[PDB]
């Protein structure tokens, strides 16, 4: 019983960590996509000019 309660508490901590990672990854993806699009547009402008 004692170690089962310990496992339950550790699982709760793992749930919080999983939620934090799930909210960070979307921000990273949005930043990468925006940077790639802006760089592509600038390169097109320069070559055309």
């Amino acid at each position: 019983v004692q170690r089962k309660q310990f496992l339950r508490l550790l699982q709760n901590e793992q749930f919080e960590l999983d939620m934090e990672e799930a909210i960070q990854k979307a921000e990273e993806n949005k930043r990468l996509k925006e940077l790639q699009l802006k760089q592509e547009e600038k390169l097109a402008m320069e070559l055309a000019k």
Binding site: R3, F6, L9, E13, E16, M19, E20
Partner: protein, 277 residues
């Protein structure tokens, strides 16, 4: 039928969208206010596992007020098939479930032996005199001294303590006398250092104790030695630890067993973060 999931606008999606938005809002409110379990555990681990600098001795005699580390040496015991190997360090251990539910440390706190070599905030002990106001003093054999641990906290001082056995007071697993930490000042915090060899013990009583040497630590009011149970395992928030009790162990020749041998470890002069080991 078939099910798709979160994003797809099919079936009963509106109530799921409401429920996930409510859960996300609650999670952000809790983590912004700071009631998050991982944040509390992170603060507790940052307080506990802080690095610390030990004292450095010149003439090899342990001084009052110096910061030392208690280390049980390793011996090839044949008592049990499974037991901790290598030198162990005496580290305090708070209660796990109460430590998760509440931020503040709950006195009394138990002790343990951990495979640790670098001095951290959990295993630095300061040798103190019960008479106090001691400057330029040498710790001697057969003399009373006390051990105080700050424990990674700059707030309070805690001391080792033990008492006579009672039907309501016992160790966690070995059912022997226990050793704990209290902030009270009494005679149950005083310990004595004695020579391991019984023939020369009274001859060496009253001599300055060497540093980094095997000595016996004996309580005063109960006259039990500090002992480390290697074969009995304690589950802890920081892994598996050996047990610690107060009991005197004798072989067939009435010589103290390697369980009772303890060694006080100072800091390396070349690198203060590392020890003499």
């Amino acid at each position: 039928q078939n099910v798709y999931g979160p994003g797809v606008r099919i079936g009963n999606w509106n109530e799921d969208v409401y429920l996930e938005e409510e859960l996300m809002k609650d999670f952000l409110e809790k983590r912004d206010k700071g009631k998050l379990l991982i944040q509390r555990s992170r603060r507790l681990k940052q307080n506990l596992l802080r690095p610390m600098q030990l004292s450095v001795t010149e003439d090899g005699y342990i001084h009052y007020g110096d910061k030392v580390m208690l280390v049980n040496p390793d011996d090839p015991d044949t008592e049990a098939d499974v037991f901790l190997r290598g030198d162990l360090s005496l580290c305090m251990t708070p209660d796990e479930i109460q430590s998760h539910l509440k931020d503040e440390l709950e006195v009394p706190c138990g002790l343990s032996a951990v495979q640790a070599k670098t001095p951290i905030g959990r295993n630095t002990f300061i040798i103190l005199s019960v008479h106090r106001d001691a400057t330029g003093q040498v710790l001697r054999y057969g003399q009373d001294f006390c051990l105080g641990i700050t424990g990674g906290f700059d707030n309070k001082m805690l001391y080792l303590s033990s008492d006579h056995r009672t039907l309501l007071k016992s160790s966690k697993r070995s059912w022997l006398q226990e050793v704990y930490l209290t902030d009270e000042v009494s005679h149950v915090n005083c310990w004595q250092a004695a020579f391991p060899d019984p023939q020369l013990r009274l001859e060496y009583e009253g001599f300055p104790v060497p540093a980094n040497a095997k000595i016996l630590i004996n309580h005063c009011h109960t006259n039990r030695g500090l002992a480390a149970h290697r074969h009995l395992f304690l589950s802890t928030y920081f892994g598996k630890e050996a047990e610690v009790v107060a009991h005197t162990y004798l072989d067939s020749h009435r010589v103290e067993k390697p369980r009772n041998h303890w060694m006080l470890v100072t800091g390396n002069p070349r690198d203060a973060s590392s020890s003499m080991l």
